[PDB]
Amino acid sequence: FDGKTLPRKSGYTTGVTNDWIYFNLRTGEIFNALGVNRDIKEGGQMNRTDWDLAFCGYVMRTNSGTSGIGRGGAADLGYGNYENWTSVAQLPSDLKWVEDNQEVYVTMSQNDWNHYLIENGLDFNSNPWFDPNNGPQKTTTNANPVLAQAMSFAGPPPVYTPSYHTYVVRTADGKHYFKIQIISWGRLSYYCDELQP
Ligand SMILES: O=C(O)CCC(CCC(=O)O)C(=O)O
Secondary structure (H helix, E strand, O other), X not given: OOOEEOOOOOOHHHOOOOXXXXXXXXXXXXXXXXXXXXXXXXXXOOXXXXXXXXXXXXXXXXXXXXXXXXXXXXXXEEEOXXXXXXXXXXXXXXXXXXXXXXXXXXXXXXXXXXXXXXXXXXXXXXXXXXXXXXXXXXXXXXXXXXXXHHEEEEOOOOEEEEOOEEEEEEOOOOOOEEEEEEEEOOOOEEEEEEOEO
């Protein structure tokens, strides 16, 4: 595969629900590349603009809306044709830009689920983490509802399939545009390249 992968095992299998690998798409910097919360812990990203895109497994976060203070966002350029998007001039005039909100689901780690029961005095016997036919508990987080479409859900039982859409991520400064396409997914394969003005 001639494209990009994340530097490590990402998301709930680490034991942490909000396990985010942060990319500064303009500078090439990567945060939490070595391990979880190693450079930036959940909530510690909201007031930094030195990141543009973060991944928690295949789920993506931009520096916008509820995830951060920046001028970012995401938009959907439709099925395929990744190599064909080269220029900001090609973007539709009426393109719908969407900022991050707190309505996107990530899988809860088994350990976070357990703490959630202890903290709320809930009986483990009537609160299983893992549904034998529906898989693990999920919870909402700050993420991008447009980029969440990069992996289509069908179920139960849940099965995830790439949409193969090209998406476009606006950077934290609001003046740079990165096309992105998720090819496969705990190892993630994708393409991400800057569009020309
Ligand atoms: O600790 C949290 O993230 C909250 C845990 C809760 C769990 C509730 C559920 O999944 O039914 C939630 O989803 O917000």
